[model samples]
Target: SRKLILFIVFLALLLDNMLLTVVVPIIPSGLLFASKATVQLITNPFIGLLTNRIGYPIPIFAGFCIMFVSTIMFAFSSSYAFLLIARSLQGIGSSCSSVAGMGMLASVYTDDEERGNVMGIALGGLAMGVLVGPPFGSVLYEFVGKTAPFLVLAALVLLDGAIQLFVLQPSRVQPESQKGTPLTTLLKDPYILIAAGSICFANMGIAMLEPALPIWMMETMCSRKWQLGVAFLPASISYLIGTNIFGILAHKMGRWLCALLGMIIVGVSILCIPFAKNIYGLIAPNFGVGFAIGMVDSSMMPIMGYLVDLRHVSVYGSVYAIADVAFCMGYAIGPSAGGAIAKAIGFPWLMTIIGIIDILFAPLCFFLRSPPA
Candidate 1:
């Protein structure tokens, strides 16, 4: 029987996406500024180190508590600085839960087929949250004022924590005697390093697009709302389709190739974005990106599995760190770069520049190399 434990995993990711898509936008934008952003930046490496050193659960708990506090703080925060503090704390909390939760989810099923299926479903929760958050938050803000969403999310987190404490008792990790490869030794593995880079490149394009593409549509292309809808609609539908499609594909192809293929797809899709003119021009490329991201989503964790011992699944802070740092780095850099290029050279130039940067990942994924051919 499929256990309810998986739903808990989905809920954790739900809060994560809510914070990512809904909460960040409501916070003051000053925190995203380059100068202060670096100070606030606690990249995934630091998180990976801490979680890898301690058990992943500790970080999860800490992250949950911090989110609780930050969510409430966001509700009442009147000043930009207050929002910054809340956001920063939320970031810390999110990393802890997000990493630990993935570790927990990944460790649950021993069978490869079962694991991939569960991951696909649970990840669907995350993607759904991302898709809904913008529209949902906008509705909530209109209906109940700015703080309603935060308050609702805080309640959700509290409930989620209670469920975790009572219902979701994961089977214990493999005993120490069964474990192989020291943490330090695994850290130095060449295959693992390449896997990490693949994750980075995957995230870089995701982060870059999150903020850049919308602005590019509005400013450079001078697109109308319907045109804007046309530009993104294909990507949206294709992304959802890609998730399920790629999950099945992961079982057939090895996970590493799936990851490589995903990166290549994303890199090509991004490179093609700048070439788009009429709204119709974006559809095929957007579909390509949707498919590519799905491939990454399906393949990233399993590839991590391939690179490490099952025992180390509990120590997946390293996995978290690899992808999160890439995500955050791209988020931090992409917006300003896109904005500046749009301002100086026009939106088309900005798209072109970002496309080139994204395409650079194609070779980077090649560096990931097929495992044992």
Candidate 2:
């Protein structure tokens, strides 16, 4: 059951990230990402509401169904408007799957240590998607054409659907023992607030770089489409390393310390991006950024799981829902704001400013002590 839970969540998150970045090299703008983020922001809490009533598997199933539709749409898209609609569908589907999938994982892994470990593996799958997605899309497009990538996505979604239906049983939501913590009270909890904030800040920094990075490569290296995909490979590889290591580190050193270190690494790395003279110059800093993100990424949900117990929440739906919101907000703001700023002042200066802001704020993690075991 544990492995099953992990596998399901892993694929869900992998699909989420793959859809997010696969379009980057092909589109050359952040609009698809923004479109996905916008829909996710609006739909996640509502999906959370649905999760409590329907059971986790249903949302997971429905999300895959929606994604299957969008993938087919994307394959046939002939205009920007169609692409936007396809991306929007993809976002909504991702939100449903991500929130429900995390909620399901939290429900299954009741132990803090085990949960942290599993969450790390699950996030690593996300990094893997981002790791392979750009290059995968580029290569497929180069050889098979744009339609092939979407078709492959559709096939993956069908596989997930089969797993959900045949292999994973619906998780039994425990009846409330005492009144669960009120939303207002949970929101005010310093631990919960800080966890969400840290995730937001971490993703914000990462997102700030996303849209700008490809453009920067084009300007600095005169990169081709496939080369643009390759540009992200270093960060993806480093992120995978960071996630797997930090997952265990979160248990050993504590989630708070891991997150703090992660943010510091990310901050310093971002500061270095602008100084790079060639595409090769970006590899080291991008790797640093990936590692830093791994530290924080490994911690986010584990901390949220702690909040679920601390607040005596009956279900994880609301807990992950809030986390999804922070993630969506950061993703939305990062590309939109980063693109605009990069256009105005250039990528180097924008990264410099974001790096300084992250470094200055690194100490904020001190407020996020681990919840009582």
Candidate 3:
């Protein structure tokens, strides 16, 4: 049951990541954020309400449908407004699906070690989506048109839903004790809040790169499309290594320490991006940042579950959702943030600012105390 839940999480993440990479290069910076942020603001909170009324699985399906429509719309987007509208609706769906899905995964894992292992594997799937999708999109875009990737992505989203319906169905145990834990109770825990905050900052910092980096590379450096792929390779390798090692790290180092270390690594890595000399120059810092993402992404979900009782899976979703919320806002603001800085100062300044913001969250990681036994 636990492993199956993990696999479902992995597959859902893969689909989401694939959808993400397809549109990055094609869209204008300012508009994408506006679209996604609008959707997130609109739908992010309602997902919690939906979870209370319906169930988590149903929401996940609904999100997939939203993504499919968004992809189709993206393919035909003739103007910025059309693209923005599609992306906004898609964000709404993604927010609902991801929060519920992660909550479902947390509900099933009963033990710390088991949760960690599951999360680590699930994160690997997410990383795989990041690592694999962009290059695939690039090639497809080159051969066909910008619309081609969205069409392919839409097909994949459909496939993901089918897998959810047919291939995955684990009987989850909802503990009687958890029913009494209110959402407010979860929020009051300072330790959990710290963990949640770190997740938000990390999410925001990473997302900021999405809209800003491509534009910077293209306009400032005059790098070609292929160069973008090469730039991401180091980060990909680093992510795998970080995630692979996290199973042992969390167990040995303790979750708080592991999470703290992860944040620190990410902070430093983002700081380094602007300072690098040429294309190859980004390898070290970006790899470190990816590694940090690997550790945090791998450890945070399981650690979040550990901070609460089994019944508050919805709260767990909410905790993670806060980061997703940040992602929406950061994504909305990121391109403009980076672009404005790059325009006024330079690309280097933009990265440095991202690094600083990320660093602000590093200390918060230590606030996540282990839950009571």
Q: What is the C-alpha RMSD of each candidate to the true structure, in Å?
A: 4.0, 2.6, 3.6
lDDT of 1 at 273: 80
The prediction achieving the highest lDDT against the true structure is: 2
Residue 179, candidate 3: how far off, in angstroms? 4.4
Which structure is stronger by TM-score: 1 or 2? 2
Instruction: Point out the higher-scoring one by lDDT: 2 or 3.
Output: 2
**What is the alpha-carbon RMSD of candidate 2 to the true structure?**
2.6
Better of 1 and 3 by lDDT: 3
Q: Rate the local accuracy (lDDT) of all candidates.
A: 0.64, 0.81, 0.70
Error of 3 at 159 (Å): 2.0
- Stretches off by above 4 angstroms in model 2 are 27-31, 169-182, 220-227, 312-314, 370-373
Which runs in model 1 stand beyond 4 Å of their true positions? Answer: 28-30, 33-54, 169-187, 224-237, 310-315, 340-350, 353-360, 363-373
Candidates 1 and 2, the one with greater lDDT: 2
> All candidates' TM-scores?
0.82, 0.91, 0.84
Clashing pairs in 3: 33-332
Better of 2 and 3 by TM-score: 2
Question: Positional deviation of 104 in candidate 3, in angstroms?
Answer: 0.8
Cα lDDT tens digits, model 2, 73-185, are 87887899988998899888988888988888888888899889888998899899887786678778879977788788778878887897776654554333344355566
Worst ten-residue run, lDDT, model 1?
Answer: 170-179
Look at candidate 2 and tell me the lDDT of residue 61. Answer: 72
